[PDB]
Amino acid sequence: MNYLNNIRIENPLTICYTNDVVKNFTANGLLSIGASPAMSEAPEEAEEFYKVAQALLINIGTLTAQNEQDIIAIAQTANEAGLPIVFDPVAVGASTYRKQFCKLLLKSAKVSVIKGNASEILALIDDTATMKGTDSDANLDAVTIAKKAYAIYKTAIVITGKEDVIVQGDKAIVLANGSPLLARVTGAGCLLGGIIAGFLFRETEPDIEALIEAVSVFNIAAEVAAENENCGGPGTFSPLLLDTLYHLNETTYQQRIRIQEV
Amino acid sequence: MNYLNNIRIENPLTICYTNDVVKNFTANGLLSIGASPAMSEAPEEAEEFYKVAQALLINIGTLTAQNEQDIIAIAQTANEAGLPIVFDPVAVGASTYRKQFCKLLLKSAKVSVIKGNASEILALIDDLDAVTIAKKAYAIYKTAIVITGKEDVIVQGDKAIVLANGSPLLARVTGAGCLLGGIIAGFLFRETEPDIEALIEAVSVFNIAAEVAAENENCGGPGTFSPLLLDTLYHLNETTYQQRIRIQEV
Amino acid sequence: MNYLNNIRIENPLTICYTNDVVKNFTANGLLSIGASPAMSEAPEEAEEFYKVAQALLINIGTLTAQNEQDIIAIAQTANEAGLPIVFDPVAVGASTYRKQFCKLLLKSAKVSVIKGNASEILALIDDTATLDAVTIAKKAYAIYKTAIVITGKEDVIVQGDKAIVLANGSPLLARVTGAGCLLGGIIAGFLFRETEPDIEALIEAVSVFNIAAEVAAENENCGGPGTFSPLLLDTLYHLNETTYQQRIRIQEVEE
Ligand SMILES: Cc1nccn1CCO
Ligand SMILES: Cc1nccn1CCO
Ligand SMILES: Cc1nccn1CCO
Ligand SMILES: [Mg+2]
Ligand SMILES: [Mg+2]
Ligand SMILES: [Mg+2]
Ligand SMILES: [Mg+2]
């Protein structure tokens, strides 16, 4: 629990350009770990905000025409500022609109972490038309998808699922913490993207240990919240998750973390 | 509890074009019953999304110029795709801006359910019990009508039913009624003329869950009620449903 | 607890033009005290809504080009309707974009209450004839001739010939996004269409909110910022005069 202590003490300003369903929950989850969220979407204030921020999250869950040019512009402003970007290509596999936009974004800017579920990351890389020799209709595992994506974008890849996978440089790790109740809370994965942004501390090429810790804090909090005697389902789980992020300590972290290399 | 079982197993993709105050809660409510919510507002992806979706909710609670043309366009896309529309004309009686828009929408697309409170549905058909209003509206639009109130009324074809479940705490949670629109969408399974039994089950699941949540020892008011509602939707079983449902045919 | 009884009985329509992170919580908080929130942002319906509303909140937390001109237009519609405006210049000190906009709004329209933290209000008054919150609030009052509410560890209100300091609340409030945003809404709920509100209304609004927060954080089921938020809403819903009078902490009153 190294980096979480620093979040709690430093209160990193974490800019979130995220979807309209999850803004409150993402901001609350960032506040619970001690970060300082700001949902700023105006390009007119990006240069000022970004100079003093520690990371930017771009999540395209409710992407519309209102957002497209602005997201590209701020991504470029983040690059120029040296502000690391976490990119969550929500539902990219569901439409050509989203596929085209994500391709455009990742041709326009260097991001620092790309985070999605297996189907999202597979759709990204399938659309690239680069993966000569790979059958995409075959049942590719998340580790394989993550390493292929890493080869394409040379950017840390985080694939969420029953087990989570992180690939950064030549290290790949698999994490096995969490709760099924997380899929039953709409902001959960989207919040994770914001939590990962919270752990970056302005590092454009984050250490894999930061990413391991971000994902593990979230998932272990979830596991603990779901065990709480007052957790009665996905509704009461959400407040308990935030409480459990707020209170998570090193002892619980170390006792619960389930990680495997390769 | 027939249709709920199907939602739980089949995880129906339910598209929601809804208001800015209730997106999260609507999504969460749909997740608690097993549905798969998607708050897609871009007309550019409607054709692709709608081909695989089971229903569309259109709720105009926070209608602005940004939304107007897009809502008309997606309603037409839904019609073309055979995707049933649930329409919630939130606060239509409060402004000529809303009244004009709702009139334009209902001249531009066939919807599958129109849901509102008595004043909303009255405003639609005007510009007085709920049963009478609902039947008049049904005559005009030839679409299922759900009027929420102390008692809820459903009219579909030549059948009208009154349901008497719920809690007073629902009125103190913003977007309770908005979420009920989404739950109704979740029960449609791509039927553009839904069975009245599906509509009865959608409203009853919601209002029985509300009743039961408000009886929970840990319900201390409208704040704690909302998490408990979601828990209760997640846990609702047939035994509770059948013991608690209060329905009368008109 | 005079005004709160009235809000519970009369159910004042309270229009909120507020930021995207806090809409749901703001509406729920207004519902909890018995107000009727409406998050109407369309200028096309402002004249009709405002004739029957009791107040308007304008909060610029998520200000973008989409909002700028609409906010100016609706503020003018409110002024023409006699509808009091509560203005929350969220993070105005953080960008020239927000500073310039707040300067434009306040030139264009008269508001009834300006609510912010000390850094926000200080940023508003920064380019003027020219440290503690009371001093900042009095300077702002001299410039805008409008009630000023400065939130902080202790809250300050200045209106008319009086300045007061209040000392209620919980540290868990800072860990709930939009607690302060919801407070702006609660203040709007206490206005009852008075464009020059009585300081007693403002004191009651802030005190109801912060006393509820204190009480909710003492609840045995409050385990952190997540469970606190539901309990805050429950405690606003149930707050009574006895608790109010026993807990209110008014620290200083000047003039
Ligand atoms: C976290 C945030 N970003 C924009 C507005 N908000 C809520 C007020 O802090
Ligand atoms: C339910 C929904 N629609 C667009 C975004 N979201 C939140 C979860 O991705
Ligand atoms: C509170 C409000 N303003 C616009 C929509 N909503 C939520 C449904 O009442
Ligand atoms: Mg996701
Ligand atoms: Mg309605
Ligand atoms: Mg609805
Ligand atoms: Mg504030």
mmCIF file of N, CA, C and O in Angstrom, chain A residues 8 11 20 23-24 27-28 31-35 37 39-42 44-45 48-49 66 230 238-240 242-243 246-247, chain C residues 20-22 25 61-66 68 91 94-98 172 174-177 222-228 230:
data_model
loop_
_atom_site.group_PDB
_atom_site.id
_atom_site.type_symbol
_atom_site.label_atom_id
_atom_site.label_comp_id
_atom_site.label_asym_id
_atom_site.label_seq_id
_atom_site.Cartn_x
_atom_site.Cartn_y
_atom_site.Cartn_z
ATOM 1 N N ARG A 8 -3.503 9.750 -0.206
ATOM 2 C CA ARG A 8 -4.227 10.268 0.951
ATOM 3 C C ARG A 8 -3.553 11.573 1.484
ATOM 4 O O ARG A 8 -4.275 12.492 1.950
ATOM 5 N N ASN A 11 -3.321 14.327 -2.072
ATOM 6 C CA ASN A 11 -4.613 14.692 -2.675
ATOM 7 C C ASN A 11 -4.482 15.110 -4.134
ATOM 8 O O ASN A 11 -4.881 16.225 -4.505
ATOM 9 N N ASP A 20 -21.698 10.456 -18.679
ATOM 10 C CA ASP A 20 -22.716 11.129 -17.914
ATOM 11 C C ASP A 20 -23.398 10.187 -16.887
ATOM 12 O O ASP A 20 -24.198 10.647 -16.097
ATOM 13 N N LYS A 23 -20.371 10.147 -13.387
ATOM 14 C CA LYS A 23 -19.577 11.284 -12.921
ATOM 15 C C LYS A 23 -19.622 11.344 -11.383
ATOM 16 O O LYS A 23 -18.569 11.468 -10.743
ATOM 17 N N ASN A 24 -20.800 11.310 -10.820
ATOM 18 C CA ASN A 24 -20.862 11.379 -9.348
ATOM 19 C C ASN A 24 -20.141 10.234 -8.675
ATOM 20 O O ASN A 24 -19.446 10.435 -7.694
ATOM 21 N N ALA A 27 -16.383 10.611 -8.984
ATOM 22 C CA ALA A 27 -15.857 11.682 -8.106
ATOM 23 C C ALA A 27 -15.873 11.196 -6.660
ATOM 24 O O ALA A 27 -14.891 11.412 -5.920
ATOM 25 N N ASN A 28 -16.948 10.556 -6.240
ATOM 26 C CA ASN A 28 -16.980 10.036 -4.864
ATOM 27 C C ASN A 28 -15.922 8.981 -4.588
ATOM 28 O O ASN A 28 -15.379 8.941 -3.483
ATOM 29 N N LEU A 31 -12.719 10.819 -4.214
ATOM 30 C CA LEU A 31 -12.663 11.452 -2.874
ATOM 31 C C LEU A 31 -12.424 10.401 -1.805
ATOM 32 O O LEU A 31 -11.690 10.690 -0.812
ATOM 33 N N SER A 32 -12.967 9.206 -1.908
ATOM 34 C CA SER A 32 -12.816 8.209 -0.844
ATOM 35 C C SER A 32 -11.342 7.776 -0.683
ATOM 36 O O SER A 32 -10.983 7.519 0.500
ATOM 37 N N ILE A 33 -10.557 7.742 -1.720
ATOM 38 C CA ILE A 33 -9.155 7.348 -1.610
ATOM 39 C C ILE A 33 -8.278 8.571 -1.371
ATOM 40 O O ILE A 33 -7.069 8.423 -1.275
ATOM 41 N N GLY A 34 -8.846 9.760 -1.285
ATOM 42 C CA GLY A 34 -8.115 10.972 -0.989
ATOM 43 C C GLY A 34 -7.634 11.792 -2.155
ATOM 44 O O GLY A 34 -6.980 12.842 -1.968
ATOM 45 N N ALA A 35 -8.060 11.404 -3.373
ATOM 46 C CA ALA A 35 -7.768 12.180 -4.486
ATOM 47 C C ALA A 35 -8.693 13.389 -4.617
ATOM 48 O O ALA A 35 -9.667 13.527 -3.865
ATOM 49 N N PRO A 37 -10.954 15.003 -7.309
ATOM 50 C CA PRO A 37 -11.467 14.931 -8.693
ATOM 51 C C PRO A 37 -11.932 16.272 -9.223
ATOM 52 O O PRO A 37 -12.392 17.120 -8.429
ATOM 53 N N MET A 39 -14.195 17.253 -12.762
ATOM 54 C CA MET A 39 -14.848 16.871 -14.010
ATOM 55 C C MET A 39 -14.855 18.078 -14.899
ATOM 56 O O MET A 39 -15.866 18.665 -15.155
ATOM 57 N N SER A 40 -13.717 18.441 -15.471
ATOM 58 C CA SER A 40 -13.628 19.602 -16.364
ATOM 59 C C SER A 40 -13.630 19.129 -17.798
ATOM 60 O O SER A 40 -12.866 18.234 -18.128
ATOM 61 N N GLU A 41 -14.622 19.610 -18.585
ATOM 62 C CA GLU A 41 -14.766 19.241 -19.992
ATOM 63 C C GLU A 41 -14.505 20.406 -20.940
ATOM 64 O O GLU A 41 -14.572 20.213 -22.151
ATOM 65 N N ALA A 42 -14.228 21.611 -20.454
ATOM 66 C CA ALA A 42 -14.062 22.767 -21.325
ATOM 67 C C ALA A 42 -12.638 22.860 -21.794
ATOM 68 O O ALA A 42 -11.717 23.013 -21.014
ATOM 69 N N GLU A 44 -11.284 25.286 -22.913
ATOM 70 C CA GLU A 44 -10.813 26.650 -22.607
ATOM 71 C C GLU A 44 -10.063 26.701 -21.299
ATOM 72 O O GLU A 44 -9.317 27.653 -21.062
ATOM 73 N N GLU A 45 -10.297 25.754 -20.407
ATOM 74 C CA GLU A 45 -9.596 25.738 -19.166
ATOM 75 C C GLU A 45 -8.593 24.594 -19.048
ATOM 76 O O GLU A 45 -7.953 24.439 -17.999
ATOM 77 N N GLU A 48 -4.700 25.552 -18.183
ATOM 78 C CA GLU A 48 -4.518 25.937 -16.792
ATOM 79 C C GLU A 48 -4.673 24.791 -15.828
ATOM 80 O O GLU A 48 -3.874 24.640 -14.904
ATOM 81 N N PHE A 49 -5.750 24.019 -15.965
ATOM 82 C CA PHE A 49 -5.984 22.876 -15.090
ATOM 83 C C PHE A 49 -4.863 21.848 -15.209
ATOM 84 O O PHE A 49 -4.464 21.279 -14.210
ATOM 85 N N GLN A 66 -21.196 16.335 -29.414
ATOM 86 C CA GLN A 66 -20.803 17.395 -28.462
ATOM 87 C C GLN A 66 -19.375 17.188 -27.952
ATOM 88 O O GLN A 66 -18.640 18.169 -27.676
ATOM 89 N N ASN A 230 -23.609 -5.758 6.655
ATOM 90 C CA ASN A 230 -24.638 -4.849 6.226
ATOM 91 C C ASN A 230 -24.764 -4.758 4.702
ATOM 92 O O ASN A 230 -25.547 -3.928 4.195
ATOM 93 N N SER A 238 -22.757 -0.335 -2.838
ATOM 94 C CA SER A 238 -22.087 0.837 -3.361
ATOM 95 C C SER A 238 -21.597 1.809 -2.237
ATOM 96 O O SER A 238 -20.420 2.144 -2.179
ATOM 97 N N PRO A 239 -22.494 2.152 -1.274
ATOM 98 C CA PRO A 239 -21.979 2.964 -0.126
ATOM 99 C C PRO A 239 -20.915 2.222 0.612
ATOM 100 O O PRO A 239 -19.912 2.887 1.081
ATOM 101 N N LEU A 240 -21.041 0.913 0.787
ATOM 102 C CA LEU A 240 -20.029 0.192 1.592
ATOM 103 C C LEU A 240 -18.716 0.148 0.850
ATOM 104 O O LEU A 240 -17.670 0.117 1.455
ATOM 105 N N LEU A 242 -17.452 2.489 -1.010
ATOM 106 C CA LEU A 242 -16.802 3.787 -0.784
ATOM 107 C C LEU A 242 -16.266 3.827 0.627
ATOM 108 O O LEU A 242 -15.162 4.358 0.827
ATOM 109 N N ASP A 243 -17.032 3.302 1.557
ATOM 110 C CA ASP A 243 -16.496 3.290 2.966
ATOM 111 C C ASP A 243 -15.256 2.466 2.980
ATOM 112 O O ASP A 243 -14.302 2.809 3.704
ATOM 113 N N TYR A 246 -12.263 4.126 1.689
ATOM 114 C CA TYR A 246 -11.878 5.205 2.577
ATOM 115 C C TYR A 246 -10.997 4.648 3.677
ATOM 116 O O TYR A 246 -10.050 5.344 4.146
ATOM 117 N N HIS A 247 -11.359 3.488 4.173
ATOM 118 C CA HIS A 247 -10.710 2.911 5.410
ATOM 119 C C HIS A 247 -9.658 1.887 5.105
ATOM 120 O O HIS A 247 -8.949 1.440 6.005
ATOM 121 N N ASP C 20 -22.973 18.785 -13.704
ATOM 122 C CA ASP C 20 -23.284 17.400 -14.013
ATOM 123 C C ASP C 20 -22.891 16.352 -12.977
ATOM 124 O O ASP C 20 -23.187 15.165 -13.147
ATOM 125 N N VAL C 21 -22.047 16.679 -11.996
ATOM 126 C CA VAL C 21 -21.598 15.733 -11.048
ATOM 127 C C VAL C 21 -22.575 15.621 -9.872
ATOM 128 O O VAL C 21 -22.588 14.655 -9.193
ATOM 129 N N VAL C 22 -23.466 16.629 -9.762
ATOM 130 C CA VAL C 22 -24.207 16.776 -8.440
ATOM 131 C C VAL C 22 -25.703 16.848 -8.669
ATOM 132 O O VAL C 22 -26.432 17.127 -7.722
ATOM 133 N N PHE C 25 -27.779 14.274 -6.529
ATOM 134 C CA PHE C 25 -27.700 14.517 -5.086
ATOM 135 C C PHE C 25 -28.387 15.810 -4.707
ATOM 136 O O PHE C 25 -29.017 15.904 -3.632
ATOM 137 N N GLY C 61 -20.042 24.493 -11.827
ATOM 138 C CA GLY C 61 -19.028 23.446 -11.671
ATOM 139 C C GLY C 61 -18.543 22.804 -12.896
ATOM 140 O O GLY C 61 -17.376 22.392 -12.971
ATOM 141 N N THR C 62 -19.437 22.613 -13.848
ATOM 142 C CA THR C 62 -19.053 21.950 -15.098
ATOM 143 C C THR C 62 -19.346 22.886 -16.281
ATOM 144 O O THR C 62 -19.730 22.443 -17.390
ATOM 145 N N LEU C 63 -18.967 24.142 -16.113
ATOM 146 C CA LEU C 63 -19.148 25.141 -17.154
ATOM 147 C C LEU C 63 -18.418 24.791 -18.431
ATOM 148 O O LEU C 63 -17.230 24.449 -18.462
ATOM 149 N N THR C 64 -19.189 24.852 -19.541
ATOM 150 C CA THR C 64 -18.610 24.687 -20.872
ATOM 151 C C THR C 64 -19.292 25.672 -21.815
ATOM 152 O O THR C 64 -20.269 26.315 -21.449
ATOM 153 N N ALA C 65 -18.822 25.728 -23.061
ATOM 154 C CA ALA C 65 -19.381 26.646 -24.053
ATOM 155 C C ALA C 65 -20.864 26.421 -24.242
ATOM 156 O O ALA C 65 -21.619 27.387 -24.424
ATOM 157 N N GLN C 66 -21.294 25.162 -24.188
ATOM 158 C CA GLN C 66 -22.751 24.820 -24.229
ATOM 159 C C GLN C 66 -23.601 25.627 -23.242
ATOM 160 O O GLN C 66 -24.760 25.941 -23.530
ATOM 161 N N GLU C 68 -22.594 28.616 -21.400
ATOM 162 C CA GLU C 68 -22.328 30.031 -21.110
ATOM 163 C C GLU C 68 -23.452 30.952 -21.450
ATOM 164 O O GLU C 68 -23.905 31.734 -20.625
ATOM 165 N N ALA C 91 -15.054 26.759 -8.159
ATOM 166 C CA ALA C 91 -13.664 26.761 -8.665
ATOM 167 C C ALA C 91 -13.283 27.952 -9.524
ATOM 168 O O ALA C 91 -12.408 27.848 -10.382
ATOM 169 N N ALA C 94 -9.703 28.708 -10.207
ATOM 170 C CA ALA C 94 -8.872 27.750 -10.901
ATOM 171 C C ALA C 94 -8.623 28.063 -12.369
ATOM 172 O O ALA C 94 -7.732 27.457 -12.943
ATOM 173 N N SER C 95 -9.436 28.906 -13.017
ATOM 174 C CA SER C 95 -9.172 29.260 -14.367
ATOM 175 C C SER C 95 -9.605 30.649 -14.715
ATOM 176 O O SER C 95 -10.615 31.142 -14.234
ATOM 177 N N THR C 96 -8.889 31.237 -15.665
ATOM 178 C CA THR C 96 -9.308 32.504 -16.218
ATOM 179 C C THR C 96 -10.665 32.355 -16.935
ATOM 180 O O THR C 96 -11.448 33.296 -16.973
ATOM 181 N N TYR C 97 -10.909 31.183 -17.520
ATOM 182 C CA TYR C 97 -12.182 30.917 -18.193
ATOM 183 C C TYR C 97 -13.360 31.121 -17.226
ATOM 184 O O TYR C 97 -14.320 31.818 -17.535
ATOM 185 N N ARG C 98 -13.251 30.543 -16.041
ATOM 186 C CA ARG C 98 -14.332 30.683 -15.050
ATOM 187 C C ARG C 98 -14.381 32.096 -14.454
ATOM 188 O O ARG C 98 -15.440 32.663 -14.260
ATOM 189 N N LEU C 172 -16.787 14.615 7.317
ATOM 190 C CA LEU C 172 -17.223 13.730 6.219
ATOM 191 C C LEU C 172 -17.849 14.479 5.087
ATOM 192 O O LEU C 172 -17.824 14.005 3.966
ATOM 193 N N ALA C 174 -16.691 16.979 3.367
ATOM 194 C CA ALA C 174 -15.657 17.213 2.349
ATOM 195 C C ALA C 174 -15.317 15.974 1.539
ATOM 196 O O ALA C 174 -14.652 16.072 0.502
ATOM 197 N N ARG C 175 -15.823 14.820 1.932
ATOM 198 C CA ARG C 175 -15.506 13.619 1.247
ATOM 199 C C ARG C 175 -16.711 13.181 0.461
ATOM 200 O O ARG C 175 -16.672 12.097 -0.148
ATOM 201 N N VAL C 176 -17.715 14.025 0.358
ATOM 202 C CA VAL C 176 -18.893 13.727 -0.474
ATOM 203 C C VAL C 176 -18.921 14.763 -1.564
ATOM 204 O O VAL C 176 -19.044 15.963 -1.315
ATOM 205 N N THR C 177 -18.852 14.355 -2.840
ATOM 206 C CA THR C 177 -18.775 15.336 -3.864
ATOM 207 C C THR C 177 -20.081 16.111 -3.900
ATOM 208 O O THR C 177 -21.181 15.556 -3.714
ATOM 209 N N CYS C 222 -23.085 4.965 10.404
ATOM 210 C CA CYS C 222 -22.225 5.735 9.530
ATOM 211 C C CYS C 222 -20.835 5.211 9.579
ATOM 212 O O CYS C 222 -20.179 5.272 10.646
ATOM 213 N N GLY C 223 -20.388 4.552 8.526
ATOM 214 C CA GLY C 223 -19.083 3.887 8.490
ATOM 215 C C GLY C 223 -18.066 4.585 7.624
ATOM 216 O O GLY C 223 -16.985 4.046 7.404
ATOM 217 N N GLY C 224 -18.396 5.745 7.071
ATOM 218 C CA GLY C 224 -17.532 6.444 6.145
ATOM 219 C C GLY C 224 -18.291 7.298 5.176
ATOM 220 O O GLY C 224 -19.498 7.461 5.352
ATOM 221 N N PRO C 225 -17.631 7.856 4.197
ATOM 222 C CA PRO C 225 -18.258 8.827 3.328
ATOM 223 C C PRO C 225 -19.331 8.204 2.489
ATOM 224 O O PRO C 225 -20.273 8.935 2.073
ATOM 225 N N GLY C 226 -19.223 6.932 2.216
ATOM 226 C CA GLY C 226 -20.283 6.260 1.416
ATOM 227 C C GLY C 226 -21.577 6.109 2.156
ATOM 228 O O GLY C 226 -22.654 6.463 1.588
ATOM 229 N N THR C 227 -21.568 5.569 3.344
ATOM 230 C CA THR C 227 -22.785 5.415 4.085
ATOM 231 C C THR C 227 -23.273 6.721 4.641
ATOM 232 O O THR C 227 -24.459 6.889 4.921
ATOM 233 N N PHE C 228 -22.386 7.686 4.813
ATOM 234 C CA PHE C 228 -22.799 8.970 5.270
ATOM 235 C C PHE C 228 -23.817 9.687 4.409
ATOM 236 O O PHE C 228 -24.742 10.324 4.895
ATOM 237 N N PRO C 230 -26.349 8.636 2.253
ATOM 238 C CA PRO C 230 -27.744 8.231 2.576
ATOM 239 C C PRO C 230 -28.237 8.705 3.924
ATOM 240 O O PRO C 230 -29.377 9.136 4.081
#
